[PDB]
Design a protein around this ligand. Structure first.
Ligand code: SF4
Ligand code: SF4
Ligand code: SF4
Ligand code: SF4
Ligand code: FES
Ligand SMILES: [Ca+2]
Lengths: 145, 588, 905
């Protein structure tokens, strides 16, 4: 998980980083400067994680590419309402115990942390209204409220 | 908590009263989606329970329904008493605005129940139909003969082992039944019909047949006449029996809707409404407001259509042959709107589980406004030309009169009940489909229900339906015409045509059928001719395990001998014109 | 064990996982990657439930029910909101790439993915991006491939490789681009590849033979039947639409075949739909072929039979017990002849004597998977009794199962079991004239002539028990192999000895009986299996009668002037010249059959009999189990001119018209009662199925689903008046939807599996007592005989070793799953799958004759110089020619025979 400048004064231990909402991991930290867009960074991370899926189990294999496509749409301002809620649901449903191995919980850790800490950058990519359908001539659509 | 949730109704005071009177172990409370307390009673205590319910401080005064169920193939009977068969008794307390269903379990070998006819006289025909279709005997019945099938019929068609489909036609049996018809009058004996003291040697027995078809259908009345006076008569019905409930066990939940349309063939979407509401209770579907308003508008249009036919045919039966032409022109204006919306005239089959088949087409409001401008002048003209004529009044006023007690004891509903002064309309007492959001009045009579008061009450009902239609036209909500539920059958068509999960849902819903989880649901509506109800039992499959249709015309035709006794035959034909029945409603 | 599901207490088996326990309790949990026969792997993540630590726990966690043991005091919730949301999300993730294909997909209405999409409540699509797409492969003539519809549940590869031991199907690629198929285009090589169309929960693998004349599952007319293509007796559900046999589905029998058929049974049904089948009785009047109805055919045949001085009847192992009995009653017991040759009858009766007098239990097909060592003597099981070979592969995997059970691994955790076992397996030793398809898993394979295989069996029996007769002249290397087999069989807790009549050697069956007796004498729990030839070979053996040679002798000497041939082409059991001469000599030949055979040209009368799809009857399989097959459809429903009756109906009516000059079409239960009254050894066929008066709460059993369509239009082009429903006086089934097919109905004959919400083959879960076990009220079919108290004696007739004589070529039988069975080789889809005709030669023999591979050489048998191309067989012993048994022109009686003047054409 991503951490902010306020978490820099934390000892690099498993217990201390664990209660900050992240993991100690390999303890080889990566710094992100202000010139890096968080949506593009998480898109790069999720592209890596989705293409490195072993393909055994459904949530990682078929839900990481969905997050990749959502982040790609958010990158060029083609996001639609419900995309961030979809990303949050993907983070919740790809956590530990839901997938076969721990590849996908690690995949969704930076996505959920970046949404938690930098939600204004993910909201900035939502420009178009939601459209999943096209009109079919002769059939009046069911306009849900 | 939604209105379709499974409830045991243990908070009903009738459950506490029954527990205090008979004890806690005397009965079993079943949790249903019927909306009523369902109580399983031992067979030996049925008459005691019925008498206790009839003598309550705010008593249960009407036997609404009485029929049977073949429970042998029912797999989900958890919490239910052991039963090969069962008989249910739906009773209504108008003063409480409550109702209770009593269920008696029966073994396969011991298929007999004590008769309910001493407590409620409409139990006569209800028990005759239960004997005819299920083979359940009722001890103490005055004459327990078949009422739907002919007397020389083998088997009981509503049993689960009876084959539903038509058997092979045979000209020999047609010839034999023609011979029975030819020598029916020659070998007529009053004793097998429940008649008595005939041929005194002053009474005559005279049979009425299919000679006056005023759109009600074909049925027979045998009259015992002292000269010109009716001293006794029994109706012979079942000539319009279509096996509609058996077809309910034969079709999917979705594919049974056209059959609901043809139960009361002047009603249309009115007939569709209780069935789709009961299915939606089984599915756990709450329809949006636009669906409620659309269904109310279609129901009121068809109520005006049916009332127009009823009033014009009554005027024709009295003798004035002119207003039927104009009233059918008004029916054509209604049909213009109904054809535009649903694509059909008389049996639209347009309501759906979870909504309606399509959205409203563009320009519906123009046709509704045209009809609402056309109707009132025509109705006033019919009133002045025919209903205020003193010859019609002299033919109809005081003819076949009954009061509140006679209406309650025979299960009379609709305008015949409200002409006795009892204010009981389902759209106000037990509101459904968003009827509580509409401003309309319930016309009631002065206390006495003649032919004339029934006809004028239906005229005021037509005016109130016009008011409801005006409100539907002025405030039609924007939104979906189908619910956002997975059991909405079929799904919205555009998503079906481009989304795979929606296409999958559509594929399985139209082919195998929607799976309704195992429950029992009930819906009662104010139909055009009275109170119509659907009682649906689902055994967890894509077809109904049991579809029981309570129709008001059955009760009205059973009330006929009590109301017409001591009158003339002209009074009888005027009474039949004023009942507002069709034989499809009676025989199902 | 005690579990609490949604606050309700249940008693379950603690050795099961939670998914199979909850499905056995009637609870609905969506699942894809788990199968009852394949174990749990936890791939699809569909079967999530919420497990709590105890009763006073409200948080819980999502677990896989298929990967979680159903241990005592386990608290789970299926209807938990988070579990339902996650299951819907798994369906939604599968739906993101799924093609918009259901109207043009053969799985529609039978699709587990459709059922689980509806079951999870997912009907709204919010995914808006592109769907991944795959190219398809050509998988041969039986299986159609459509990889777009794949949900990557891994069921196909797990079945094909881990269960069926196939090698040419696999998974390729990675992430969301995983592909399931062959490494290149080609026919799927496994004999059990057809089970993929039921194993795959989507429409990736589909029945191509059904796809040609496709119809949906709700439009089918189903009947419970028995596969007629070999002796194993796998239970099938044939489905018919518009008067033609459309599909063969697996009918679950927890005792015999459970979930799986072989490809011959699944795809070899096409002979029923052949347009040259007889549909009316035809009388040959000179050069004219006039068409009769049933009554005048009976009258004319009865008159001619009454004028005859001696009428003989020739039965067949193709025909049912009732048909053979009716022929035997028509002609008399002393005039009844089995249609098989003398050597085949001797081998079949020896196999029968070993089965019902040897004192050694014969296992059912499911029970074979529980044995710890297998010796197959002579019988090429994969080509003759294929499902036995599949069961033997499971019994071979038993060693990994036992090793994993020693390490406290649950029996459903199949990946851990396979990892622990590695390449360890239970001992398997196969003997044949050449290599078999079981050689990949066999501990040893013996390629030798049938006499040498019998001598190896006799030597094994003698080394197991010194009272068994010894074999002189065994080489030390063969002696070491024999000792290896002996210590493998002696150390086994449950040894199984498999043999049969297809090797063409009496001594092979005798040696197998000797080995089984020696193992029984040491106190082992030994089982013996005999593979017969045809569907009712064992029934014809139990009934008995003279051989076809005796019938031909009676026809040739003129002692018999009338012959009635029942369902027998007569060329597979005797030389065609002798059969044709004997039939031309007879002044009356009557042929009762459902296939246009070559002996119908000289037949004076041809009775259009019914095949198994249009008939009812009883067949006795290789283990002696009597099984009833029921009629699928009425052949006269569409074509009203079709007079096609059951063979027993034809013969009973002929007997009645011969005796009393009156017709009697009788009833099936009457014929069964006559069988059990006259033949006490067949008395168990009465209880194979209940009679026609059996009802479920007063109603019959439905043959077709409740949503069967087109009732008022399927015959409307012939006549707008709907015909009468076809009446079934023979059985308890009705030719309509107006009947019972409830999974809780107290019966054992299930025409098809359907439950609300389960339209796929997964509805068999609802029809079982526990998932993967038996049918709820018992599997159908009863065993005719119990294990006898006393066994046989040792067979002392040890044959001499094979010696190659100069100028004489011993015929080594080669069997093919696609081609050796007669009716299935008549199926048009089998012609592409059929191997080209050939003759196998040793390299030394081919070099001595100066021929290479592919050169056409000619040989004469019974005065028929026929020419076949040569292929080189490495494993065939010299002095032998390998011939494909059962093919066109090569009768199965040629096995064990000898060949003269075999030279290059
Ligand atoms: S979470 Fe692990 S097991 Fe599942 S597909 Fe991804 S990498 Fe494979
Ligand atoms: S595999 Fe199933 S869900 Fe997919 S297209 Fe075929 S029927 Fe539809
Ligand atoms: S091809 Fe079928 S069985 Fe194989 S992984 Fe795909 S969906 Fe599963
Ligand atoms: S093993 Fe034999 S009985 Fe079974 S499916 Fe194959 S051919 Fe039919
Ligand atoms: S069935 Fe359990 S994860 Fe697939
Ligand atoms: Ca039959």
């Amino acid at each position: 998980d991503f951490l902010t400048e306020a978490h820099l004064d934390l000892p690099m231990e498993f217990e201390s980083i664990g209660k900050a909402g992240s993991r100690l991991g390999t303890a080889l930290a990566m710094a992100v400067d202000h010139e890096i867009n968080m949506v593009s960074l998480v898109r790069n991370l999720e592209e890596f994680f989705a293409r490195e899926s072993c393909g055994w189990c459904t949530p990682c294999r078929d839900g990481l590419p969905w997050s990749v496509k959502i982040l790609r749409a958010l990158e060029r301002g083609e996001g639609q309402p419900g995309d961030i809620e979809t990303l949050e649901q993907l983070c919740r449903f790809l956590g530990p115990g839901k997938t076969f191995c721990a590849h996908a919980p690690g995949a969704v850790e930076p996505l959920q942390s970046a949404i938690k800490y930098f939600r204004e950058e993910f909201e900035a990519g939502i420009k178009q209204p939601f459209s999943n359908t096209h009109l079919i001539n002769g059939i009046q659509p069911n306009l849900l409220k | 908590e939604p209105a379709w949730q499974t409830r045991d109704h243990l908070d009903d005071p009738v459950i506490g009263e029954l527990r205090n009177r008979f004890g806690p172990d005397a009965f079993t409370v079943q949790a249903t989606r019927t909306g009523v307390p369902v109580v399983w009673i031992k067979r030996e205590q049925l008459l005691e329970v019925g008498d206790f319910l009839k003598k309550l401080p705010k008593p249960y005064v009407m036997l609404f329904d009485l029929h049977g169920m073949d429970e042998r193939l029912r797999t989900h009977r958890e919490g239910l008493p052991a039963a090969d068969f069962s008989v249910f008794y739906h009773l209504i307390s108008i003063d409480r605005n409550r109702d209770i269903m009593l269920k008696v379990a029966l073994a396969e070998n011991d298929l007999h129940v004590p008769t309910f006819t001493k407590l409620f006289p409409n139990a006569n025909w209800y028990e005759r139909e239960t004997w005819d279709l299920f083979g359940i005997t009722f001890d103490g019945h005055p004459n327990l003969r078949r009422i739907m099938m002919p007397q020389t019929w083998k088997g009981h068609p509503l049993r689960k082992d009876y084959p539903a489909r038509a058997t092979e036609f045979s000209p020999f049996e047609l010839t034999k039944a023609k011979q029975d018809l030819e020598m029916e009058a020659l070998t007529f004996k009053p004793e097998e019909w429940g008649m008595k003291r005939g041929t005194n040697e002053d009474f005559m027995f005279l049979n009425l047949g299919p000679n006056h078809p005023s759109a009600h259908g074909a049925f027979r009345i045998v009259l015992q006449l002292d000269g010109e006076e009716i001293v006794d008569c029994v109706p012979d019905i079942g000539y319009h029996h279509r096996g509609a409930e058996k077809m309910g066990e034969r079709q999917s939940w979705h594919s049974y809707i056209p059959y609901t349309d043809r139960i009361e063939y002047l009603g249309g979407c009115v007939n569709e409404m209780p069935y789709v509401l009961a299915v939606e209770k089984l599915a756990g579907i709450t329809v949006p407001d636009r669906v409620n308003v659309i269904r109310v508008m279609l129901s009121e249009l068809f109520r005006i259509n049916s009332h127009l036919l009823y009033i014009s045919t009554f005027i024709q039966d009295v003798g004035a042959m002119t207003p039927v032409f104009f009233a059918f022109t008004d029916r054509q204006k209604i049909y213009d709107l109904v054809e535009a919306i649903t694509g059909f005239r008389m049996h639209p089959a347009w309501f759906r589980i979870g909504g309606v088949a399509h959205d409203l087409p563009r320009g519906w409001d123009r046709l509704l406004r045209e009809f609402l401008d056309w109707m009132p002048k025509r109705l006033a003209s019919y009133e002045k030309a025919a209903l205020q004529n003193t010859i019609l009044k002299g033919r109809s006023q005081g003819v076949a009169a009954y009061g509140a007690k006679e209406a309650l004891e025979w299960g009379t509903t609709g305008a015949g009940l409200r002409a006795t002064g009892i204010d009981f309309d389902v759209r106000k007492a037990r509101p459904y489909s968003g009827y509580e959001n509409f401003d309309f009045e319930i016309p009631v009579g002065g206390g006495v229900s003649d032919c004339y008061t029934r006809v004028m009450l239906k005229v005021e009902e037509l005016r109130q339906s016009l008011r409801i239609l005006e409100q539907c036209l002025n405030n039609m909500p924007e939104g979906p015409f189908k619910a956002d539920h997975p059991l909405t059958t079929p799904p919205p068509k555009e998503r079906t045509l481009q989304h795979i999960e929606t296409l999958i849902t559509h594929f399985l819903q139209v082919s195998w059928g929607p799976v309704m989880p195992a429950n029992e649901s009930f819906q009662m509506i104010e139909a055009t001719k009275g109170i119509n109800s659907y009682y649906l039992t689902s055994d967890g499959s894509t077809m109904s395990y049991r579809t029981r249709v309570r129709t008001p015309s059955f009760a009205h035709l059973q009330q006929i001998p009590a109301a017409i006794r001591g009158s003339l035959v002209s009074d009888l034909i005027v009474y039949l014109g004023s009942i507002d029945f069709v034989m499809s409603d009676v025989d199902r | 064990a005690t579990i609490h599901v949604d606050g309700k207490e249940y008693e379950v088996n603690g050795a099961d996982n939670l998914l199979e326990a909850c499905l056995s309790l009637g609870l609905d949990i969506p699942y894809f990657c788990w199968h009852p026969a394949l174990g749990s792997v936890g791939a699809c993540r569909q079967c999530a439930v919420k497990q709590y630590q105890n009763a006073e726990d409200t948080r819980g966690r999502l677990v896989m029910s298929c990967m979680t043991p159903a241990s005592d005091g386990t608290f789970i919730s299926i209807d938990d909101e988070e579990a339902k949301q996650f299951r819907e999300s798994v369906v939604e993730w599968l739906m993101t790439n799924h093609p918009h294909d259901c109207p043009v997909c053969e799985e529609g209405g039978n699709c587990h993915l459709q059922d689980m999409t509806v079951m999870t409540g997912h009907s709204f699509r919010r995914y808006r991006f592109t769907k991944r797409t795959h190219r398809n492969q050509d998988l041969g003539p039986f299986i159609s491939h459509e990889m777009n519809r794949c949900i990557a549940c891994y069921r196909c590869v797990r079945y094909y490789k881990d269960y069926a031991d196939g090698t040419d199907l696999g998974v390729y690629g990675a992430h969301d681009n995983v592909y399931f198929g062959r490494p290149e285009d080609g026919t799927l090589e496994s004999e059990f590849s057809g089970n993929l169309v039921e194993i795959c929960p989507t429409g990736v693998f589909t029945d191509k033979t059904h796809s040609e004349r496709y119809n949906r599952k709700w439009d089918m007319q189903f009947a419970p039947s028995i596969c007629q293509q070999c002796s194993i007796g796998c239970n099938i559900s044939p489905g018919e639409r518009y008067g033609e046999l459309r599909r063969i589905e697996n009918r679950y029998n927890g005792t015999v075949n459970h979930y799986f058929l072989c490809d011959r049974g699944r795809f070899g049904y096409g002979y029923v739909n052949l347009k040259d089948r007889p549909r009316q009785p035809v009388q040959r009047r000179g050069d004219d072929f006039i068409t009769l109805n049933a009554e005048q055919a009976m009258q004319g045949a009865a008159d001619i039979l009454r004028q005859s001085k001696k009428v003989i009847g020739i039965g067949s192992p193709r025909a049912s017990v009732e048909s053979n009995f009716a022929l035997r009653e028509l002609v008399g017991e002393e005039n009844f002849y089995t249609g098989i040759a003398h050597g085949e009858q001797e081998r079949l009766q020896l196999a029968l004597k070993v089965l019902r007098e040897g004192g050694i239990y014969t296992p059912a097909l499911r029970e074979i998977e529980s044995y710890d060592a297998v010796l197959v003597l002579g019988e090429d099981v994969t080509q003759t009794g294929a499902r036995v070979a599949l069961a033997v592969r499971q019994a071979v995997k038993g060693k990994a199962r036992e090793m994993a059970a020693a390490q406290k691994v649950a029996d459903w955790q199949i990946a851990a079991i396979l990892n622990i076992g590695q390449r360890a397996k239970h001992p398997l030793f196969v003997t044949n004239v050449d290599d078999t398809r079981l050689d990949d898993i066999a501990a040893w394979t013996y390629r030798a002539p049938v006499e040498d295989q019998a001598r190896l069996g006799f030597a094994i029996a003698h080394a197991l028990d010194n009272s068994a007769p010894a074999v002189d002249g065994i080489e030390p290397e063969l002696q070491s192999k024999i000792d290896v087999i002996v210590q493998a069989l002696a150390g086994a807790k449950k040894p199984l000895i498999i043999s049969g009549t297809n090797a063409g050697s009496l001594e092979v069956i005798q040696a197998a009986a000797n080995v089984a007796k020696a193992l029984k004498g040491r106190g082992a729990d030994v089982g013996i299996t005999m593979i017969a030839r045809s569907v009712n070979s064992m029934g014809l053996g139990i009934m008995g009668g003279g051989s076809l040679e005796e019938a031909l002798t009676e026809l040739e000497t003129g002692r018999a002037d009338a012959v009635v041939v029942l369902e027998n082409d007569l060329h597979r059991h005797a030389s065609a010249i002798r059969v044709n001469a004997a039939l031309a000599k007879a002044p009356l030949v009557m042929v009762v059959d459902h296939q246009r055979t070559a002996i119908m040209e000289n037949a004076h009368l041809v009775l259009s009999a019914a095949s198994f799809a249009e008939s009812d009857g009883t067949v006795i399989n290789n283990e002696g189990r009597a099984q009833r097959f029921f009629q699928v459809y009425d052949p006269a429903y569409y074509d009203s001119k079709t007079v096609m009756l059951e063979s027993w109906r034809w013969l009973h009516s002929l007997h009645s018209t011969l005796l009393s000059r009156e017709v009697d079409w009788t009833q099936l239960d009457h014929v069964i009662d006559a069988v059990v009254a006259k033949i006490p050894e067949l008395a168990g066929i009465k209880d194979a199925a209940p009679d026609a008066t059996f009802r479920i709460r007063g109603q019959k059993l439905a043959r077709e689903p409740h949503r069967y369509s087109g009732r008022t239009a399927m015959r409307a082009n012939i006549s707008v008046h709907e015909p009468r429903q076809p009446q079934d006086i023979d059985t308890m089934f009705t030719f309509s939807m107006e009947g019972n097919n409830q999974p809780t109905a107290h019966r054992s004959q299930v025409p098809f599996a359907w439950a609300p919400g389960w339209n796929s083959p997964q509805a068999w879960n609802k029809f079982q007592d526990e998932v993967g076990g038996k049918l709820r009220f018992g599997d159908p079919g009863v065993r005719l005989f119990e294990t006898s108290e006393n066994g046989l004696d040792y067979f002392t007739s040890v044959p001499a070793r094979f010696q190659p004589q100069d100028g004489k070529w011993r015929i080594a039988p080669y069997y093919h799953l696609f081609g050796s069975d007669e009716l299935s080789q008549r199926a048009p889809v089998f012609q592409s799958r059929m191997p080209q005709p050939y003759i196998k030669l040793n390299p030394a023999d081919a070099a001595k004759l100066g021929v290479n591979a592919g050169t056409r050489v000619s040989f004469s048998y019974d005065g028929n110089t026929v020419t076949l191309p040569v292929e080189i067989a490495e494993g065939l012993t010299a002095g032998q020619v390998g011939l494909p048994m059962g093919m066109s022109g090569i009768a199965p009686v040629l096995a064990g025979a000898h060949l003269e003047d075999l030279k290059e054409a």
